[PDB]
């Protein structure tokens, strides 16, 4: 008919890829450049912060590498903001800001230097670059792993970068992929950036709809009705959460015990059984011809 292509020979020759590329999760080309440290430092680690976005949540981590697997030292998840007041809007540009700021302040507390290195206590959306003062221990410095995402203009990855930089970390960057930047003129605004952070875009869209039409409004922003939030307090809402993070960022865990030990999954079949199916199968097939 037509030649088969996936045959015995195909598989003998074949060569598989590393596991995370087949899953589709990792780019070893770029991971090489990042993680490896120069060979004249010998154990001085190269911390990178990680930022990933799901469909419903945001994860930010800091990590360094070894032979055995990447070590983690501090993490922050955007689903524990209601402990700080924010109830909804957990995937937008703004939650990224609060997410990063939480992360920084938690990090600094563990080392010990949360008294100093406070960054912008008053948000302005300008360009701020932290400085490591003298007589005091050096500032933390790390790098950014975006991943597979595109770094076009206005992602929710750079909205997390700023929370950490305004929180007190030292990171190199540049003001091209912040919102408030004109390609046609190559200038930065530094107030539009502030709008995106406080959520006034969302307010504009809600007020736009409540005027125009109400069915689509209830369909688009149902869960802003539950918890009865409105466009009139967004700016105060996040502005209070920021101060809450700056006050009590320490984390606590959740113990649970005495689980009933139920197996919700089927185990593997053993050899004796596998040899017993085929015999009784052969039996049935023979019997059905003596049936005739």
């Amino acid at each position: 008919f037509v030649k088969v292509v996936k045959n015995k020979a195909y598989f003998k020759r074949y060569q598989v890829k590393f596991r995370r590329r087949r899953e589709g999760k990792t780019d070893y080309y770029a991971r090489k450049r990042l993680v490896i440290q120069d060979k004249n430092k010998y154990n001085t680690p190269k911390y990178r912060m990680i930022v990933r976005v799901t469909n419903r949540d945001i994860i930010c981590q800091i990590a360094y590498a070894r032979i055995e697997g990447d070590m983690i030292v501090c993490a922050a998840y955007a689903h524990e903001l209601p402990k700080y007041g924010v109830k909804v809007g957990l995937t937008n540009y703004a939650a990224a800001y609060c997410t990063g700021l939480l992360l920084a302040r938690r990090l600094l507390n563990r080392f010990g230097m949360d008294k100093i290195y406070e960054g912008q206590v008053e948000v302005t959306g300008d360009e701020y670059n932290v400085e490591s003062i003298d007589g005091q221990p050096g500032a933390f410095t790390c790098y950014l792993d975006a991943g597979l995402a595109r770094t076009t203009t206005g992602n929710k990855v750079f909205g997390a970068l700023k929370g950490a930089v305004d929180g007190g970390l030292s990171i190199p960057h540049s003001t091209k992929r912040f919102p408030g930047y004109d390609s046609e003129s190559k200038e930065f605004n530094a107030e539009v950036h502030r709008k995106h952070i406080m959520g006034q875009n969302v307010a504009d869209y809600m007020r736009y709809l409540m005027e125009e039409d109400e069915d689509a409004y209830k369909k688009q922003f149902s869960q802003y009705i539950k918890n009865n939030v409105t466009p009139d307090m967004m700016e105060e809402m996040y502005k209070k959460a920021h101060a809450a993070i700056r006050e009590n960022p320490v984390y606590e865990k959740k113990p649970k015990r005495e689980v009933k030990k139920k197996r919700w999954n089927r185990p593997k079949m053993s050899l004796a059984q596998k040899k017993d199916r085929v015999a009784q199968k052969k039996a049935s097939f023979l019997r059905a011809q003596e049936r005739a």
Binding site: E23, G24, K25, L148
Partner: protein, 169 residues
């Protein structure tokens, strides 16, 4: 039942090949843009051929692709031209079909004197939810055989939605 196993139209493709490169192609462009509401794009040869009369890297054809509810309208118009009668021999093993029109004027469109007549080709691509994952750059997969489409399934869809007519071959 079948809550998320329900067919639709992914996209509708529209192609016109001429042979030449110039005014005919420009006229042919204005056609498609008027039928869809959006600019088409011009397509270039791959390698040169003598008897057909063409060189390499010269614009020949023009195509465009539509999506949404506009597709259903244009397909509806095209089938009124076709009297809703198709053959089994126009369906494929992937769950897709297509056909071709010899004159565009039957669609309910005027005749500009500045523009002659033209033909064109429709090709319809079916689908159902959970096919974006194949082009998805984040974590790409393959969809599975219980969820793929057949030559036969497309027939009964066409029989059902329009009371079309399959013909022998």
């Amino acid at each position: 039942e079948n809550p998320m196993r329900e067919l639709r139209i992914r996209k509708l493709c529209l192609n016109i090949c001429v042979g030449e490169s110039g005014d005919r192609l420009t006229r042919a462009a204005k056609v498609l843009e008027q039928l869809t509401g959006q600019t088409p794009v011009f397509s270039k040869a791959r390698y040169t051929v003598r008897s057909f009369g063409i060189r390499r890297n010269e614009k020949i054809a023009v195509h465009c692709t539509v999506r949404g509810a506009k597709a259903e309208e244009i397909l509806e118009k095209g089938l009124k031209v076709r009297e809703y009668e198709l053959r089994k021999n126009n369906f494929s093993d992937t769950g897709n079909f297509g056909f071709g029109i010899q004159e565009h004027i039957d669609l309910g469109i005027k005749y500009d004197p500045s523009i002659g007549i033209y033909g064109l080709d429709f090709y319809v691509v079916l689908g159902r939810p959970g096919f974006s994952i194949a082009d998805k750059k984040r974590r790409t997969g393959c969809i599975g055989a219980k969820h793929r489409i057949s030559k036969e399934e497309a027939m009964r869809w066409f029989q059902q939605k329009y009371d079309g007519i399959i013909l022998p071959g």
